[PDB]
Amino acid sequence: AKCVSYGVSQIKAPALHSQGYTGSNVKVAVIDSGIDSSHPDLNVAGGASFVPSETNPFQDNNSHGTHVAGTVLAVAPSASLYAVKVLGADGSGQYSWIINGIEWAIANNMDVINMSLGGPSGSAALKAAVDKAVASGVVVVAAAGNSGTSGSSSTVSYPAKYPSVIAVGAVDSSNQRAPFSSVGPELDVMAPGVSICSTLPGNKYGALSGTCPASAHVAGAAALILSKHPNWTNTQVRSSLENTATKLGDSFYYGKGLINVEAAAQHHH
């Protein structure tokens, strides 16, 4: 919205905006550090905190959840955001809190979950939660991780590494993989994640880099697609994103390539 970012153009979201599609009547759970609901550039429809030391989901003492929220709305200006707080101010949280946030999102009929987070190990309970959300029809998106490379090893974080999740890596403004962007066969798509200007807490704006902003673009893209195709299943939304991506190089580094929401939203299955 108020801070200009190249990322919205890069994924061809303006083509949907010109068609009149802005993610109307789509519920997106921002599973992160909260959202500063006081920010003039944001609107928050609901939410919940599972961080025992940080009980307000509508404040953000980390900044990432608020930044992610702004990127989702830059891509899908009409999306309904829900602040699902599972990370503290230091950007860490327990998997049980994260799972409680996913469970809340399922119970409250979210259309899209964005998880701008991950750890190097997952759990069976974490996999069961994302698999259940996907079985329930939710589009589940996660940041692939900022762990760079490890030779031929996967560095994709959990829960992005699980097959049911859309694992999002980060490119720069010229579609080059960002040096921090995690890699491996579990990587699904890329999106803009270098120096992305978005909302920060306390009526502020600023650039951040990471797979966190990249995931936000794909969560916004899912909302644009559902506004044009509200009947599409999560299966069909996911297919539309992966099958119409712009190929960028070896799938170990780039997955299917850069999301193209214009192409995805006119995909014929």
Numbering used by the authors: 1 to 75, 85 to 278
Pull text from the paper.
Omniligase-1 is a broadly applicable enzyme for peptide bond formation between an activated acyl donor peptide and a non-protected acyl acceptor peptide. The enzyme is derived from an earlier subtilisin variant called peptiligase by several rounds of protein engineering aimed at increasing synthetic yields and substrate range. Mutation A225N in the S1′ pocket and F189W of the S2′ pocket increased the synthesis to hydrolysis (S/H) ratio and overall coupling efficiency, whereas the I107V mutation was added to S4 pocket to increase the reaction rate. The final omniligase variants appeared to have a very broad substrate range, coupling more than 250 peptides in a 400-member library of acyl acceptors, as indicated by a high-throughput FRET assay.
Inspection of the crystal contacts of Pre-1, Pre-2 and Pre-3 revealed that at position F189 (S2′ pocket) the enzymes in crystal form A as well as in crystal form B have close contact (3.7 Å) with Asn109 of a symmetry-related molecule. A Trp instead of a Phe at position 189 would be too close to this Asn (2.0 Å W189-CD1 to ND1 or OD1 of N109) which cannot adopt a different conformation because of steric hindrance. Thus, Oml-1 and other omniligase variants containing mutation F189W, which is crucial for the broad substrate scope, cannot be crystallized in crystal form A or B.
